[PDB]
Design an enzyme around this catalytic site. Structure first.
Site, PDB file in Angstrom:
ATOM      1  N   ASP A  35       0.837  -1.195   0.000  1.00 39.51           N
ATOM      2  CA  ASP A  35       0.000   0.000   0.000  1.00 39.51           C
ATOM      3  C   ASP A  35       0.878   1.254   0.000  1.00 39.51           C
ATOM      4  OD1 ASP A  35      -1.891   1.932   0.374  1.00 39.51           O
ATOM      5  OD2 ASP A  35      -2.423   1.364   2.430  1.00 39.51           O
ATOM      6  N   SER A 199      -0.708  15.276 -12.359  1.00 38.40           N
ATOM      7  CA  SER A 199      -0.969  14.878 -13.727  1.00 38.40           C
ATOM      8  C   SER A 199      -1.239  16.110 -14.579  1.00 38.40           C
ATOM      9  CB  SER A 199      -2.164  13.917 -13.773  1.00 38.40           C
ATOM     10  OG  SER A 199      -2.544  13.624 -15.109  1.00 38.40           O
TER      11      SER A 199
END
EC number: 3.4.23.22
Length: 330
Positions: A35, A199
């Site tokens: 994780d 992004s």
């Protein structure tokens, strides 16, 4: 040193991924959920409330000759999806894919929440976010990666998750045969303890690319892709009959649909998520309504590039003094 371990979907829908981890002496192998969105290595154990264990493999520290109780230490974690666990702490030898850390903090669960009990495939989590998020008190502990870092050939790990197929976590090296083209690297902020990056935009199907900054985290421990409502609406608008369902808890779509791809930008590069990766199957057994793999982040407080996005790429978690993230197509 290096390590290399195969990671395997827990079910036919890639609802999470498990990677075998050796703990203790002799080794006790547990299947952990790696994780990159959290920083605790915790396991189901011989100390876990019996009624909260249902089929998981447990760590039994009394059977490990290298286990030592970390005196006074406790931990307690609450995840973004509402799940939680807590307990006490041992140090022990932990190996992943041939890479060994001695003195690793292994957080032994005394209590876990229902979603953990109900998932018999996951024996615990191995956190790979920054150690500043580790919950051990009163002395915060380091992640497996943090502990391994100095010994690794290069201070990196890579995630290569499969779509409906096994994949690989590598530590200490970049497998240049595992991706196509080049790896595009992008800046990371560690201010919130995550692999947080921006992004450069997105496209839906064969549509034009929209240049827009989307701050979010690379999180292998989140199954789906969570993005701003505007982006998500633009995606599902291309699927006849798709709608956001308050009762179901997100966007659903007719299981008869062929889904469009979704592209996200990494600098000037583009990662394409095929439409099939966005199908999470019937909302309930026998239903013709299917759950979408792209969902709104509204009310999460953060955008999350979870497995849906990451599995479309070869992803480098570069843990150099100034961390960065790399993405390649594959």
């Amino acid at each position: 040193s290096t390590g290399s371990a195969t990671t395997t979907p827990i079910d036919s829908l890639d609802d999470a991924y498990i990677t075998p981890v050796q703990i203790g002496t002799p080794a006790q192998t547990l299947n952990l959920d790696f994780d990159t969105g959290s920083s605790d290595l915790w396991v189901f154990s011989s100390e876990t409330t019996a009624s909260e264990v249902d089929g998981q493999t447990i760590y039994t520290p009394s059977k490990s000759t290298t286990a030592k109780l970390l005196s006074g230490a406790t931990w307690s974690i609450s995840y973004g999806d509402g799940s939680s666990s807590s307990g006490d702490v041992y140090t022990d030898t932990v190996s992943v894919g041939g890479l060994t850390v001695t003195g690793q903090a292994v957080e032994s669960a005394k209590k876990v929440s229902s979603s953990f009990t109900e998932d018999s495939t996951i024996d615990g989590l191995l956190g790979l976010a920054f150690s500043t998020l580790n919950t051990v008190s009163p002395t915060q502990q380091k992640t497996f990666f943090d502990n391994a870092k100095a010994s690794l050939d290069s201070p990196v790990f890579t995630a290569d998750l499969g779509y409906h197929a096994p994949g690989t976590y590598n530590f200490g090296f970049i497998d240049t045969t595992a991706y196509t083209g080049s790896i595009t690297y992008t800046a990371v902020s560690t201010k919130q303890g995550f692999w947080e990056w921006t992004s450069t935009g997105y496209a839906v199907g064969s549509g034009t690319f929209k240049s827009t900054s989307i701050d979010g985290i690379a999180d292998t421990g989140t199954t789906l892709l969570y993005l701003p409502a505007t982006v998500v609406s633009a995606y599902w608008a291309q699927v006849s009959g798709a709608k956001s369902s308050s009762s179901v808890g997100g966007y659903v779509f007719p299981c008869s649909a062929t889904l469009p791809s979704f592209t996200f930008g990494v600098g000037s590069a583009r990662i394409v998520i095929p439409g099939d990766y966005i199908d999470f199957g019937p909302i309930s057994t026998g239903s013709s309504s299917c759950f979408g793999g792209i969902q709104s982040s509204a009310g999460i407080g953060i955008n999350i590039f979870g497995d849906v996005a990451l599995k479309a790429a070869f992803v480098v978690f570069n843990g150099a003094t100034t961390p960065t993230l790399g993405f390649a197509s594959k």
